[PDB]
């Protein structure tokens, strides 16, 4: 399920994201030895945290947003969040004729584009596999012919089976709405709803 944004629903301009906050949550056990050497240990997973802020909402905008959020809480679905700043179209073509060799469980994807894709991905972009909902950021990219060497920040959450297909454009965050236990919005005497905030967390 997609969170309402002024792409799909421009008739409600108040539903735009006044300010997004992409939080990098990678819990680690960091210990500082007296000999000056700082040591880290990583066990848990990394999850992208998204915080959405909203302006004053008119009754119709709030009605639409609240209906969507209540539909989410009713069906127990997953809110999809689209960040416009990450929607630069660089890689274009078909992602079905590209092959990803299997057995890749590290933090690096080696894929043979088979010359079917034009353009090259840029470092810091958003990358995602077609068979897993986790979202990756490209930290480095070296192309030697048709084989690409894409480096990802989160260690690969799945081991490639050889059937996965890279996804570069149209990437959505399969988030789950936090702070929904006590979710409310105050209606002022002037008819507009205020104090609406969405603390979302990537529940892959």
């Amino acid at each position: 399920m997609r969170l309402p944004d002024p792409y799909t629903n421009p008739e409600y301009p108040g539903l735009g994201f006044e300010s997004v906050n992409l939080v990098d949550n990678d819990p680690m056990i960091r210990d500082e030895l007296p000999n000056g050497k700082v040591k880290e240990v990583k066990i848990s997973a990394q999850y992208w945290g998204i915080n959405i802020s909203y302006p004053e909402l008119f009754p119709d905008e709030y009605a639409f947003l609240d209906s969507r959020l209540l539909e989410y809480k009713r069906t127990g679905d997953y809110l999809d969040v689209l960040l416009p700043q990450y929607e630069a179209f660089r890689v274009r073509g078909d992602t079905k004729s590209v092959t990803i060799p299997a057995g890749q469980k590290g933090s690096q994807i080696i894929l043979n584009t088979n010359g079917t894709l034009t353009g090259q991905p840029k470092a810091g972009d958003l990358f995602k596999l077609s068979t897993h909902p986790k979202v990756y950021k490209i930290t480095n990219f070296s192309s030697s012919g048709n084989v690409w060497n894409i480096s990802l920040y989160p260690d690969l959450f799945i081991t490639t089976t050889g059937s996965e297909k890279p996804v570069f454009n149209g990437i959505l965050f399969r988030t789950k709405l936090m702070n929904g236990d006590s979710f409310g919005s105050t209606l002022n005497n002037n008819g507009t709803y205020s104090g609406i905030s969405l603390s979302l967390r990537e529940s892959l």
Partner: protein, 105 residues
Amino acid sequence: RDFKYTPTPGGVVGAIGKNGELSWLPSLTNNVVYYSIAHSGHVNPYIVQQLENNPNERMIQEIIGEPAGLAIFELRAVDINGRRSSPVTLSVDLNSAKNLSVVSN
């Protein structure tokens, strides 16, 4: 179904020879998590995990460097709860010239 060993006749160096891969269509029953194939030369079985759900869509597992000679493969599906399927057996003799695919269609 369709446990078919698809061999690659590519001329590879003698020291390490890339044996062709093998394919087997996903089990019809849902709630299958991975696929454990026994191997002649390896005690441990190769495992391929089916996270997605793509019926009628083939899957591939490849073996490289195995010694030339007789090979026997036994593949079994595994349930999310822990059940294991009946074995699927396929024995193929490994040789560079013996590396020719089955007649198709």
